Curated annotation (Swiss-Prot), chains A, B:
Cofactor names: Mg(2+)
GN (gene name): pnp
NCBIfam families: polynuc_phos, PRK11824.1
Domain KH per the UniProt entry, residue ranges: 553-612
Stated family: Belongs to the polyribonucleotide nucleotidyltransferase family.
Organism, scientific name: Escherichia coli (strain K12 / MC4100 / BW2952)
Keywords for the protein's UniProt record, in alphabetical order: Cytoplasm, Magnesium, Metal-binding, Nucleotidyltransferase, RNA-binding, Transferase
Subunit structure: Component of the RNA degradosome, which is a multiprotein complex involved in RNA processing and mRNA degradation.
Subcellular location: Cytoplasm
Gene3D superfamilies: GHMP Kinase, N-terminal domain, K Homology domain, type 1, Nucleic acid-binding proteins
EC class of the enzyme, as a word: transferase
A Pfam family per the record: PNPase
Name by which UniProt lists this protein: Polyribonucleotide nucleotidyltransferase
Disulfide bonds listed in the record: none
Biological process, per Gene Ontology: mRNA catabolic process; RNA processing
Length: 695, 695, 79, 79
RNA sequence: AAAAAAAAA
């Protein structure tokens, strides 16, 4: 017999029902969380034996949208769900980023959270359900875990926040925000707004957290009822003796080494002191593990840089907390792309390039909620020659598929509606050099490229990453944190928006609790920095160009009869294939008879127009048709005319005189007008050169 | 001028042509076996130096179907043969399962059998040829190999067995089973039957074996003719000292431990026993091998459990040999799938979900034998959390593509005929906890889900996994064998049928010398257990539900006049594209007048069939024919009622005098009755107002 | 701020333009060679310290053609 | 391969039939694709020589021009 | 012989 421990409550409008104990009894824990007929079956399994000699914590969060949830057989050729799509990877990262800071420091047991989507209802997004389920499952399992973390989605409709809006409500909403936080403080935010002020975004965050408190309480109650006993896991007791021994020699020397302005001399000096210290540590006692010394050195460097930045001393870069690194904006750097730009900020650089295409190129996304065509593709490539180290290129890693979406949220607020711009822009952004805040450099470069290719975006956008170092009640916000500073910064949040409002927000706070006031001050400083960046960017190019680049495919429209569109289709599309091959353009066909002629140069456009038009023009009374006899036989020559319908001039209908040889009557290359009296349907169209040959 | 060695023999109606020595000389041995114009080129490469510290036999059998065998450029976009398809993986496992238990114990040199298919007669299936080829290659190579293994594929026609049938015959057979065994015993059987009785299945097995004795003899002849010298390979001699100091010190305590009925006490006891023995044995000598110590301990405990079950003591589970584990059955456990079930037996369970799709979703796979469209998809998912360990979710492994086909073979016997139920059932089963016999739990759950979703299967169908243990003349047969017991069992079966008959008989013996009476007794016990499981399942769901789920797309089939299809549809498919784009349904047509209407909503299909009946409206006597004339001309009254139905109203039938304005006597939009007098060949239709106003 | 070093010459018929120093400063070297409106951006990254106990030279050359070069969104179903 | 045969152009409509039922039935019977032009040239495309032979024979039975000495199978259906 | 335009681219 099976004893399913079910616990259901009320969340917003829907009724979440947590249900454990019945399935996957062999995994460490598994809950089937269902909200309003959308059910996600999350399950956690964490090994007990620490892998001997581990340095990083290996948490993986697979998320699978099984397409039998909506109730459809998959569309792939193998008829089976395969590699996870970009959406599923995005939601996996969205589940991953809240929980990882909650596992206590010094935990290195492999833990894997496989949240599959068994059933979906089109109004309720499964992702929030999966997040709630992941938190509930982790809390039930007894793996060392500090929060039972809720998830909430808030939307802005009629200036009033709505919790967990349905997709139809979401279409009206200005802002879509996901806030996942512990009982104590927010723990992550991943937004996409529509140029809202900072106060509105902050209110949304605080509202979502204050409301998801309920899910948190109820998961705690379930854990208390039917959870497993907590693991007997103790962090490695801090070897204060060795730490103090290394510190007594290293503290002042590394403080002064970091105190000097030049970066590379400090690099070399601290590396040689590191070599000296590890040499002494090994020589004095071989048994001491190398990774322990590495951790000690990491602690020393982190501590010294944090103590420095807290006291107000200039950062490792040498800038004040406000100062943004110098920028250099370049546009049209690529000769033949539809539009390109190169946004270098400090050491972070991005070569962004926007390319227009016709509606046939829009990605057709087949996801659980519904089929959806995308007419704005943003891809973000992070090649390994950026950081400075070799590495195998390949399919995009999760972080690239996450930052692609982040930059796309950054730019989506200002893209034009399809009726105003009937193209499908695709923006790529290769990161030639990275030193921190790469995705926001990509947002700036994408705004630049779009403004250059000729897209009529509303206003340029720019993104500035930020940081925050807090100890006790003393906190200093950091602007444009470097890659090195990112380790030090407690909270990393990225703000990207036009001058008016915030297009996208992506907080990722990690330590203790940050008061609303802290977030407000940080957001205001980010607004200032973003205004400065936008000014500098406006100095280079202030308004999108007049028209698209000459290479860009222009749009030409022609109207044709509905049967004629079938005629131009032909057998499986042979006529259209031949037409595009001979003219070199791209033609789109609709059932209502509109024709979309898309070609770069107007000459190819008019070539397509004339070539198609000859077939489009119906045979009309009085007007002669141009026909060339392709084959001559002794018993008659038929003048092939085209259009699927050929009229034959039988040997008995040419003249009453005995036609002896067609060669002496019709010569190779005889372009003569043919008198067509009518168009018959029986397939024997009457052609007559006799009336045209009398004169 | 190298010279091949060819030996050809009759094997049924087809003739087989083994041939070696000509190609692939550098491989350890290669054999081109061709049966009746179907040729499979099999080659085997066996390394000579075992990798240091190898513990498991790394034999990997590949199998590639080259699409140039049938004479066809590949369909794939790259026009190149891709990764192994499902059929190729299945046939690879087919080749693999017989030849693995045949290599002697302790052999660990890598071996690779690559079987390519270079020419395929669309009648004789290649898999049997490839099995004969792998057998001949391995037995020719001189790699230590017990006996050459022959393959057969018995069919069942007119209650008379038939050897190795052709697809034309196979379309009429009830059963096809691939019995492949060496001369001594039947190594493997893989079956699919239309509810055949056990006795018939066993007769088929023994018949196939008695027949492929020929292939055995003739591969033996070819080996004696043109073979290679057997390798000098000797098994590692067992260490009598280690065996003694483990046995006399621990085996009695281990027997007393396995005497304990509870699982956890026994676990703790065996742990303390092995730890104590390892501790004292290292205390005697540290150089003694820990790995070999644990291996010998495992051998001891295996011998203990085997001696326990043979004597007749209760098994590790505590069940008697006949009795099945516990059972629990739920249906409709998911909210929005078309049908679902959660068949949990003991500690092995599966969450199966059947999802009906329209006839456009059927998988169309291109095989060498010929392009075949598959309208029943079974998919088997074995995620890592099921067995209780973390892992790498990804593409399905070979086990998953083997058990998918096994379960699909088990259910295919009872699924309905396409005339009685036009859909495309796809069944997905996710194992959420597996402890042996997972695929048979999947079969039970699939029958359950099918009966839930509403498909009218002919009868419930369930599967059980038997196990056989034999020593000398004493043999005991187990039921619902666990995963741990699998090491102990020698012969594994997987009988899976309805109460009337068997549907799948996959089996894989290892020991040599099982009389067919043993198999008869085991099959009888399996019939008993399967009747029990079906009795339990009978409580949850009695018969398939009358109506499919409301979410299901609903297919309605109507019959229409085959001649009027060109009158109502017309050329180019204009109106059919119009209806499919206005109603959003999929409509296809046959030459006889059969048309299916597929739409995910009832009312939408009602609208579609309304449109079809209006456009195909006959000349019903007494029904009003409403025509809307908005503008009147001199030549007639143009009224649009669709279907190309236009009539010329003559001026001589309006009034006797010449009309100066038609609007004085004929009203705009007024309803005119139109009686069709006759339907001519040219499509001429006339309108009759005078005779239709009064009648 | 940053300034590139460019040197362009006549090569047969077209005019090649070698340009370095502007982009990809963090790689070991990187030059964007273009030959009459056809640019190719090559970057070399060599490790400073050899792998301990290495026997074969691990040169790996990758050449990727971004479809946006021609001016077309790619054709692959994932675009 | 492609098999080409020339039959009288006027006698096509006898074998094509109303709405092309005869030709489509014959094609699904022989598994090939027959092509006919207004001048009566019969173009048979086939994926095999045997299917080509089957289609060509079925064409000779009915589609061929009426030949003297060719025997017609006449069966009464009702007395 | 009824019908845009390719995970297986
Ligand atoms: Mg950062
Ligand atoms: Mg088993």
């Amino acid at each position: 017999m099976l004893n399913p421990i079910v616990r259901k409550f009320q969340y917003g409008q829907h009724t979440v029902t947590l249900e454990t104990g019945m399935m996957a009894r062999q995994a460490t824990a598994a809950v089937m969380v269902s909200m309003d007929d959308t059910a996600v079956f999350v399950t956690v399994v964490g090994q007990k034996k620490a892998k001997p000699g581990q340095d990083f914590f290996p948490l993986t969060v697979n998320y699978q949208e099984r397409t039998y949830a909506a109730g459809r057989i998959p569309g792939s050729f193998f008829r089976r769900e395969g590699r996870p799509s970009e959406g599923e990877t995005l939601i996996a990262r969205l589940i991953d980023r809240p929980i990882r800071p909650l596992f206590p420091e010094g935990f290195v047991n492999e833990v894997q959270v496989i949240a599959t989507v068994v059933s979906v209802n089109p109004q309720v997004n499964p992702d929030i359900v999966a997040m709630i389920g992941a938190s509930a499952a982790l809390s039930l399992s007894g793996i060392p875990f500090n929060g039972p973390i809720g998830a909430a989605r808030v939307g802005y409709i009629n200036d009033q926040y709505v919790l967990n809006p349905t997709q139809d409500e979401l279409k009206e909403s200005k802002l879509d925000l996901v806030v996942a936080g512990t009982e104590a403080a927010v723990l992550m935010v991943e937004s996409e707004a529509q140029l809202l002020s900072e106060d509105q975004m902050l209110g949304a965050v605080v509202f979502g957290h204050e409301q998801q408190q309920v899910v948190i309480q109820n998961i705690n109650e379930l854990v208390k009822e039917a959870g497993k006993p907590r693991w007997d896991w103790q962090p490695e007791p801090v070897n204060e003796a060795l730490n103090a021994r290394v510190a007594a020699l290293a503290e002042a020397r590394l403080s002064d080494a970091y105190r000097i302005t030049d970066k590379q001399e400090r690099y070399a000096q601290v590396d040689v002191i590191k070599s000296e210290t590890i040499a002494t540590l090994l020589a004095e006692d071989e048994t001491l593990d190398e990774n322990e010394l590495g951790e000690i050195l990491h602690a020393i460097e982190k501590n010294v840089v944090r103590s420095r930045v807290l006291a107000g001393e200039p950062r490792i870069d040498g800038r004040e907390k406000d100062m943004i690194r110098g920028l250099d904006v370049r546009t049209g750097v690529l000769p033949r792309t539809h539009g390109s730009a190169l946004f270098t900020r400090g050491e972070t650089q991005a070569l962004v390039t926007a390319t227009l295409g016709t509606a046939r190129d829009a990605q057709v996304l087949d996801e659980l909620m519904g089929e959806r065509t995308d007419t704005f593709l943003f891809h973000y490539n992070f090649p390994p020659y950026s950081v400075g180290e070799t590495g195998m290129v390949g399919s995009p890693k999760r972080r690239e598929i996450g930052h692609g979406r982040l930059a796309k949220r950054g730019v989506l607020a200002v893209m034009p509606d399809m009726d105003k711009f009937p193209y499908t822009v695709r923006v790529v952004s290769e990161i030639t050099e990275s030193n921190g805040s790469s995705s926001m450099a990509s947002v700036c470069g994408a705004s630049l490229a779009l403004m250059d290719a000729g897209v009529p975006i509303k206003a340029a956008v720019a993104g500035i990453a930020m940081g925050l170092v807090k100890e006790g009640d003393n906190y200093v916000v950091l602007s444009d944190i470097l890659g090195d500073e990112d380790h030090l910064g407690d909270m990393d949040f990225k703000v990207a928006g036009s001058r008016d409002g915030i297009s996208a927000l992506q907080m990722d706070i990690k330590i203790e609790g940050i008061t609303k006031e802290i977030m407000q001050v940080a957001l205001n400083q980010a607004k200032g920095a973003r205004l400065h960046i936008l000014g500098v960017m406006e100095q280079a190019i202030n308004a999108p160009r007049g028209d698209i680049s000459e290479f860009a495919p222009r749009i030409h429209t022609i109207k044709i009869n509905p049967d004629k569109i079938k005629d131009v289709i032909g057998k499986g599309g042979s006529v259209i294939r031949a037409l595009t091959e001979e003219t070199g353009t791209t033609i789109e066909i609709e059932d209502d008879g509109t024709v979309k002629i898309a070609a770069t140069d107007g000459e190819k456009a008019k070539h397509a127009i004339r070539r198609i038009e000859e077939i489009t023009a119906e045979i009309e009374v009085g007007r002669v048709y141009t026909g060339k006899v392709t084959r001559i036989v002794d018993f008659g020559a038929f003048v092939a005319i085209g259009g699927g319908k050929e009229g034959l001039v039988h040997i008995s209908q040419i003249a009453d005189k005995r036609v002896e040889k067609v060669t002496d009557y019709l010569q190779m290359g005889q372009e003569v007008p043919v008198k067509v009296l009518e168009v018959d349907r029986q397939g024997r169209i009457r052609l007559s050169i006799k009336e045209a040959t009398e004169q």
